[PDB]
Every structure is written in C-alpha cells, then in structure tokens.
Amino acid sequence: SSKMLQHIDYRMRCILQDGRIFIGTFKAFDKHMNLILCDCDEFRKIKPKNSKQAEREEKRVLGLVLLRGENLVSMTVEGPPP
C-alpha cells in the first residue's frame, strides 16, 4: 500500500519540527516525504511572555509550498478536496 496517496488532494495540516503548522491542499509527495501544498497557510504559536497575556497564533499566507521532508513531523487532514 502507498498510504499517503490516499491522503492526496485533501486539505491537510502538516506539523513541522519547530512547531509550525502548514494547512494546505496536499498535492504531491515523494520518498523523502517532501510535500507540495497548494494554498498553504503557516501557523506559528506565539509565546505569551507575561502572566496575563494570552497565547496567540500568527497565520501567514504562503501559496504553493514545497515543504522539505526533513522538516515534517506528522500530517493530518482538515478538509475534503475544494
């Protein structure tokens, strides 16, 4: 079986090693688990640095993303193919 091919073309959330989140349409992959994500958005967790400040999530729009496979931790699905 080629399990990641079942997850193809879905809106998928991909967790990077430094803690980032990549939500993108998972178009393609290969042996090293590089990803091609269309319409991908990255999400950085922001440390609060205070006792009363909340923890926020900053989202950057990226577009067509090639994610190198050594950065990837784990991928989950968010949505059907749009």
């Binding site: 809106r11 939500i23 319409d39 958005d41 989202k59 968010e78 949505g79 059907p80």
Partner: protein, 162 residues
C-alpha cells in the same frame, strides 16, 4: 430555501483576494443563519451577499474568522451574543441593510478585537451625531466606513451624551 450544511459543503471554498480562507454564499436568499459549525474552523472570511437574513444571529463558535461580509441583506435587528462565538474578528461588513436606531448598533461594542466596520447604505447613517456615537460606543474600531478615525472625532465623541 433555508440554510443547512448542504449549502456549505457544495459552495466555493478558496483563497480570497486579500489572501484569507473564503467560503462564498452569494445569491442564496437565506433568511436565517444556522448550522455553520460544519466549516470546521478552517476559514477567515465568509461572504453573505444577496440573502434575506432578517437578523444577524445564530452564529456558532468559530475562532479563526477575521471577516464577516453581510453585504446587501435585510438586517433590521442585530444579534448581541456575537463576541462569544467570533473572538478574533477584524472586519464586519454590514453594508446595505435596514439599521435605523442608534441603540441597534449597541451590541457591536462587545467585540474587543474589531478593527474595521462598514455600515454604509443604512438608515442609521442618516441620523445626526451618528459616527461620533459609533466611536464613543465601539472605541476599538480603527476604520469606520472606510474613513480612518481622528482624534477630533474621539474628543467630540467623548464630549457628547455625558
């Protein structure tokens, strides 16, 4: 026609011109908003052009939303418990509705993170001391009806109705 999850699942889901996640709901004649939580919090802006929504209510908890586009609807009354369900909003686009009284804008002060408002083509724009009442009511808004707020407007907003 009433709105369900069915019209959510089939509609256009994409990246808008301002590069956020967008769901389009143009031209559906929706009278009541319900069952939106099937969007699974993957969206930042939802359009609602050409629907017959009488009141902006029924909004479930969606945290990632930053824009509501309620262009050309029939909003005569407004919902009050909106800030508990849309915590990170930035734009509210309430153009071409039937808001008439000043107190009808009163629930809008509850959104803390709100930055941009558009209440154009509304009878509530027609009355005197309107914009200063919006500033004195909702202070966190930085752009009102595509006019940036000025400190003279803040001062004459604080002066009135003391």
């Amino acid at each position: 026609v009433k709105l369900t999850a069915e019209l959510i699942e089939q509609a256009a889901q994409y990246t808008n011109a301002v590069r956020d996640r967008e769901l389009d709901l143009r031209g559906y004649k929706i009278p009541v908003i319900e069952n939106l939580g099937a969007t699974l919090d993957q969206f930042d802006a939802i359009d609602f052009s050409d629907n017959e929504i009488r009141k902006l209510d029924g909004f479930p908890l969606l945290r990632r939303l930053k824009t509501l586009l309620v262009n050309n609807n029939r909003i005569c009354r407004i919902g009050e418990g909106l800030d508990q369900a849309l915590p990170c909003l930035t734009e509210l686009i309430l153009t071409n509705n039937s808001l008439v009284e000043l107190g009808d804008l009163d629930p809008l002060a509850s959104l803390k993170s709100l930055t941009y408002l558009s209440i154009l083509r509304n009878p509530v724009t027609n009355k005197k001391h309107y914009r200063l009442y919006v500033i004195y009511k909702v202070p966190q808004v930085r752009v009102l009806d595509f006019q940036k707020v000025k400190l003279k407007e803040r001062q004459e907003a604080e002066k009135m109705f003391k």
